[PDB]
């Protein structure tokens, strides 16, 4: 089994970062995982990543720095309504000055600072800081 793909991915990157590894191996790839890691890269918590291709489900290899501290999954996937947002944002972030809870909306996957500017809630996926 592996009922949550996203949940198994992030624990690897958490464990790896602690030891100090700067290359990892994450499987299986999913499109959901790609856009996740895209957001995590833009802000600058991780570096460029390579998708190896198979004909099964792919595998991914990542280049990372010590900048990452902790990325989590939130299971099950709750709804957020842009007043429920603030209650969430307190609990998952160590500060008001940094960290980004991530979520998916009908306007696509993005961080919370961006979602508030689209004025649309949606389903929450994970978090990080």
């Amino acid at each position: 089994v592996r009922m949550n793909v996203l949940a198994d991915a992030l624990k690897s990157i958490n464990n790896a970062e602690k030891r100090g590894k700067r290359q990892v191996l994450i499987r299986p790839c999913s499109k959901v995982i790609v856009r996740f890691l895209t957001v995590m890269m833009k802000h600058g918590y991780i570096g460029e990543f390579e998708i190896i291709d198979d004909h099964r489900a792919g595998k991914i290899v990542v280049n990372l720095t010590g900048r990452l501290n902790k990325c989590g999954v939130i299971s099950p996937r709750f709804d957020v309504q842009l007043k429920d947002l603030e209650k969430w944002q307190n609990n998952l972030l160590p500060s008001r000055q940094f960290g980004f809870i991530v979520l998916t909306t009908s306007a696509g996957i993005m961080d919370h600072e961006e979602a508030r500017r689209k004025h649309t809630g949606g389903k929450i996926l994970g978090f990080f800081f």
Binding site: M41, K42, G47, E48, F49, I52, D53
Partner: protein
């Protein structure tokens, strides 16, 4: 003739007509006829590259695609000289569909085949460009500005043959798909 031996798709163009004319002429000629058969194409097109060179594209009906791919090198050689200094490559004419939801109107008449979807076509397109080498690996890289560059590891069978065509494929692919590609060869193969 030369304007009615290629079905609909850019019927009056000078070069494209002159391609078809000498193409079918050769196929009927007895110089080779053991790898050449009189058939029609379905279109053609000429597109440049920034390398300071032109390249011709020849599309085919696609079930007839199997026969065109057979000779493909000898034939291309003759047309490299006939249209001097241009590379010539075959490709397959593949249809691509909007989503079954929420653009073009349908009654859900069909299922939207996965052999007529977008992604399946762009994979098949890559196979034609580097046809005499075949494809051993694919890898992809993602850049910090959200761009993506698609490395393609090709077999070292017929390495040299497509290694003097290696840049010209990239400018071709850009125009056909929209995507960015690079090529390489490894030293390790099954």
């Amino acid at each position: 003739s030369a304007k009615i031996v290629k079905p609909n798709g850019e019927k009056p163009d000078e070069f494209e007509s002159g391609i078809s004319q000498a193409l079918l002429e050769l196929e009927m000629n007895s110089d080779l006829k053991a790898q050449l058969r009189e058939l029609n194409i379905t279109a053609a097109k000429e597109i440049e590259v920034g390398g300071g060179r032109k390249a011709i594209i020849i599309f085919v009906p696609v079930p007839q695609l199997k026969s065109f791919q057979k000779i493909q090198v000898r034939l291309v050689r003759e047309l490299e000289k006939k249209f001097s200094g241009k590379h010539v490559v075959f490709i397959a004419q593949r249809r691509i569909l909007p989503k079954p939801t929420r653009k073009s109107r349908t009654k859900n008449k069909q299922k939207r085949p996965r052999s007529r979807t977008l992604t399946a076509v762009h994979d098949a397109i890559l196979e034609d460009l580097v046809f005499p080498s075949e494809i051993v690996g694919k890898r992809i890289r993602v850049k910090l500005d959200g761009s993506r560059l698609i490395k393609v590891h090709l077999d070292k069978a017929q390495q040299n043959n497509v290694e003097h065509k290696v840049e010209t494929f990239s400018g071709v692919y850009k125009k056909l798909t929209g995507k960015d590609v690079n090529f390489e060869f490894p030293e390790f193969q099954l």
